[PDB]
């Protein structure tokens, strides 16, 4: 229990450390944000994927493992679940529209790339894990055995659509930094690239953690009767 | 059982065209290989690395849940196991030492990215798997005590390092692509990008495959007397 809550402790700490790293690299290290930039527009992309997708769907994955929630109510437990991913589902398609923005309007091409890719396929497959979880799991009239047995591939499809969210950031942090940092190259170890090689190592910890959480048996969320 | 049968059936399919799709791309749209191209010496990192690290490790991964193994013995499963991971670390050593050797004769940088951090780090971890799951489940001399709590360590570790192994070579297709697609450009859909993007697509869906057959309880080698 206690080593838990250092666990949970330290998955905070990683996960809000991404937030402000990315944010730092985008005030700071880029042009900043605005909903008009063009790139001042894009770089809400990364900000806004690392802060609902990867981390407020981090937090989403695991609340029901929180113990001072076991003696709540399981539908408020469900409420606070979707929820939860509701908002990362927003942010996350505020997040490629602000792409589809960006590039529309400056003439650039869309899907070619391996990134958007498995980006979009995380982001429909996104959108069908809360569909069906909402009306299957919130929702009333699902028969019992319906749950029983849409359940494994619920939490299945939940960890593989986590994994590649983060796989998808990496590969995000790759092409920005190639196509960015020219002069002084990315090949030069100037300071952004260590910046964002290590909020991309921060990412990565983050989904480790979250993992681990998540697949501890003993905090699973006790049956109920 | 014989829906085990159709998750392995497909996990190998997939994976024989992951090498396939190396081989074919470094073969066909790159330059080919070689011990000294100096490219051709590169284009053995992809094609190793899809081969030994996602495809021998991912079935090294789900050897012991093969039925016709469980009245097999356990030092021969552990022997299987052990081994074909052992082959996937040499030929990912193999893989790391060709790129060093293209760049330090090339005058290129090491390290620098954050594919490589990631990569190194897998890489790193991966062989301390192998060294403390082979001086710990293969020799003989190791308490069973210190079995019964390293286990949980060393099958979380082994799906996480899968996992960010999986990640790397997407990043690492990525920054091929945008490295070497300029004219035409990745941009533009070229033949290379659609088949890279498509080689990227099987070796997620493959580790989703070994994900899924790695994760039934059902399928889990029955536990020895
Ligand atoms: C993109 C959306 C979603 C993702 C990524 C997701 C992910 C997950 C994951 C990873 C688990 C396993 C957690 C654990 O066992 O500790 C889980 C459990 C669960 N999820 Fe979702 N989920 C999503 C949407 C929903 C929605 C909308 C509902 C509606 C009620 C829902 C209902 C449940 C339930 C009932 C459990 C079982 C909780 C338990 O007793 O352990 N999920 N979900
Ligand atoms: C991890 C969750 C992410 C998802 C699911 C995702 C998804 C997508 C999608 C669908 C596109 C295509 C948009 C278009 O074609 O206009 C895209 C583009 C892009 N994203 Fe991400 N993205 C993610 C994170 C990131 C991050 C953290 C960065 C950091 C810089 C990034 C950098 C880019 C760039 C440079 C593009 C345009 C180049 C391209 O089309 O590949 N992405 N992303
Ligand atoms: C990089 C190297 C390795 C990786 C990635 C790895 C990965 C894994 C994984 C993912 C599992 C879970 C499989 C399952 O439960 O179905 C596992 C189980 C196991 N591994 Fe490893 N392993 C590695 C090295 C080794 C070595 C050298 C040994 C030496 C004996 C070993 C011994 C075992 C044992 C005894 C099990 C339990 C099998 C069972 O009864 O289910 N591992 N390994
Ligand atoms: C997935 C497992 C992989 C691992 C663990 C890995 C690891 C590494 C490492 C450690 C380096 C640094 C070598 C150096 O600095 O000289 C590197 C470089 C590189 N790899 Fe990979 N690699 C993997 C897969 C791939 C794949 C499939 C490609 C496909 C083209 C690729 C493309 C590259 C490129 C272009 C470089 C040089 C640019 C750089 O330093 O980032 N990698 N890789
Ligand atoms: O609706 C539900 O389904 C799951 C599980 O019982 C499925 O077997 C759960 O925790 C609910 O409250
Ligand atoms: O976001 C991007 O960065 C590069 C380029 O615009 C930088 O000048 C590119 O092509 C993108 O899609
Ligand atoms: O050496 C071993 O350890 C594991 C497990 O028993 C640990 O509890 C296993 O399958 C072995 O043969
Ligand atoms: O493998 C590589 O491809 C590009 C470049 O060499 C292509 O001309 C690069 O810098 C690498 O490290
Ligand atoms: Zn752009
Ligand atoms: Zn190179």
Chains 1, 2 share one sequence.
């Not at 929180?66 to 942010?91: F, Q, R, Y």
């Not at 796989?167 to 930094?177: I, N, Q, R, V, Y």
């Not at 190639?178 to 190592?201: C, K, M, Q, W």
Request: hydrophobic share 55%.
């Amino acid at each position: 229990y206690w080593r838990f809550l250092a666990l949970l402790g330290s998955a905070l700490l990683v996960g809000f450390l991404s937030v402000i790293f990315a944010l730092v690299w985008v005030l700071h290290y880029r042009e900043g944000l605005g909903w008009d930039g063009s790139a001042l527009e894009f770089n809400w992309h990364p900000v806004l994927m690392v802060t609902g997708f990867v981390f407020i769907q981090g937090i989403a994955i695991i609340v029901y493992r929180l113990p001072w929630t076991w003696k709540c109510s399981k539908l408020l437990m469900k409420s606070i679940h979707a929820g939860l991913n509701a908002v990362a589902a927003i942010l996350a398609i505020i997040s490629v529209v602000a792409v589809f923005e960006n590039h529309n309007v400056n003439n650039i091409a869309n899907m070619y790339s391996l990134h958007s890719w498995v980006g979009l396929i995380a982001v429909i497959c996104y959108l069908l894990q809360l569909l069906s979880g909402f009306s299957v799991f919130l929702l009333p009239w699902a028969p019992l055995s319906l749950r029983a047995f849409l359940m494994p591939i619920h939490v299945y499809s939940g960890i593989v659509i986590f994994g590649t969210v983060i796989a998808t950031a990496l590969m995000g942090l790759t092409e920005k930094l190639i196509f960015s940092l020219r002069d002084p190259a990315y090949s030069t170890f100037p300071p952004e690239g260590v910046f964002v090689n290590t909020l991309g190592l921060l990412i990565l910890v983050f989904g480790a953690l979250i993992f681990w959480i998540v697949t501890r048996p003993q905090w699973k969320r006790p049956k109920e009767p």
